[PDB]
Amino acid sequence: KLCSLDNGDCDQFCHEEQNSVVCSCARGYTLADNGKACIPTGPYPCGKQTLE
Amino acid sequence: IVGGQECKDGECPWQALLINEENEGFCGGTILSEFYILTAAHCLYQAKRFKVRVGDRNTEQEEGGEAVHEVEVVIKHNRFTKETYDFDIAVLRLKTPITFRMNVAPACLPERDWAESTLMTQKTGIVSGFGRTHEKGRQSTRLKMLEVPYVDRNSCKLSSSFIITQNMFCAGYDTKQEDACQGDSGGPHVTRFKDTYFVTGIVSWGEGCARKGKYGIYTKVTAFLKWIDRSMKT
Ligand SMILES: CCc1c(N2CCOCC2=O)cccc1S(=O)(=O)N[C@@H](Cc1cc(-c2ccc(Cl)s2)on1)C(=O)N1CCC(OC)CC1
Ligand SMILES: [Ca+2]
């Protein structure tokens, strides 16, 4: 249930607070309009295997 | 690294190499941000003063993307004990900011509750370094990576002849000849979630290298996440 089932559809961190899933992102990322996906604020974000 | 595969272009960008006055590498490290490097406390006894190398994959020849940064503040944990390797954590502050590129990128610091519930419950983890290829062998000139699976606490304690504290965790194989070695110490242990890599451990110690019935001991980052955030302000 919630964060236990598919990480609550969050791209990164998941935490429960009086019902309904709350998604959050790490430093160098911004939370998307859907409130689940993490969008980078720079060209080289953390934890990503670079190609360019 | 005993066995495994070598790091390719952009595969291991969080890797940092601690070098002495003769450019020789002694310990590994993890890039957290533009100014901060995560390493082991025991590594600050090998050589001092020391420097930090980023974007290095091959030691015998200089590569297009390598950079040398000097340490400003050395935040070594006060509760560190060389007799057991408990509280084996150190945060380094640099004089100049790190420029991120193809071989240089940081690794995300996860949230304490989410890392224990989601990251620690994962099947495998990834370790990297310029360490020994064999237990008695020489240090690798090429940067190597290895997929190490998480080992349960009971199996971890029963296998070890030395004490395993709450700040320590087991990862690796039981009989297979694949484990981290001497020189990899202070290096990164990353756990993959979707397509993002998070800091979960620090290469600490072990009863030899890839020995049957023995695992690799790592410093548990989860127990020090509040300490790392406090160190990043000063
Ligand atoms: C039992 C481990 C140990 C110790 N320790 C460390 C912590 O607990 C007590 C103790 O006896 C001390 C000296 C030698 C050995 S050992 O049996 O020869 N294994 C050695 C071999 C080794 C093992 C590793 C690994 C580190 C992380 C891995 Cl995962 S494997 O790196 N080197 C060792 O752990 N050393 C400590 C660090 C280092 O100094 C830079 C080189 C030696
Ligand atoms: Ca080089």
β-pair type (B196-205, B188-193) = antiparallel
- For residue A22, the 8-state DSSP code is E
Q: What is the CATH number of the domain that holds A1?
A: 2.10.25.10
Evaluate the omega torsion of the peptide bond into residue B101 and state whether it is cis, within 30 degrees of 0.
no
Residue B27 DSSP SS3? strand
Which residues of chain B are in CATH 2.40.10.10 domains? 1-12+107-222, 13-106+223-234
Interatomic CA distance for residues B144 and B179, integer angstroms:
11
**Count of helix runs (H) and strand runs (E) in chain A:** 0, 4
Distance of alpha carbon B88 from the chain centroid:
11
CA-based R_g, chain B, Å: 16
Residues contacting residue A1 through CB under 8 Å, at least 6 positions apart: none
Q: Is the Cβ–Cβ distance between B43 and B52 less than 8 Å? A: no
Which domain covers residue A43, as residue numbers? Answer: 1-52
Chain A residues inside the 8 Å CB shell of B119: none
Distances (CA, A) of A7 to A2, A40, B119: 7, 20, 11
Sheet containing B144-149: which strands, arranged edge to edge? Answer: B5-6, B144-149, B124-129, B188-193, B196-205, B216-220, B168-171
- For residue B132, the 8-state DSSP code is B
Cα A10 to middle of ligand 1, angstroms:
39
Which of B204, B69, B206, B185 has the alpha carbon at shortest distance from B129? B185
Tokens (6 digits) for B75 = 């935040």
DSSP string, B7-32: --TTTSTTEEEEE-TTS-EEEEEEE-
**Total of domains in chain A:** 1
Sequence letter at residue B140: S
- Resolution (angstroms) equals 2.6
Instruction: Write out the H or E segment, with its range, that includes residue B204.
Output: strand B196-205
Max intra-chain CA distance, chain A: 42
Q: Is the Cβ–Cβ distance between A48 and B192 less than 8 Å? A: no
- The CATH number of B1-12+107-222 is 2.40.10.10
* Ligand 1 neighbour B162 (Cβ under 6 A): yes
Which of ligand 1's atoms lies nearest the C-alpha of B43?
A: 40
- The CATH number of B13-106+223-234 is 2.40.10.10
Tokens (6 digits) for B173 = 């194989």
Q: Kindly report the protein residue whose alpha carbon is nearest to atom 34 of ligand 1.
A: B205
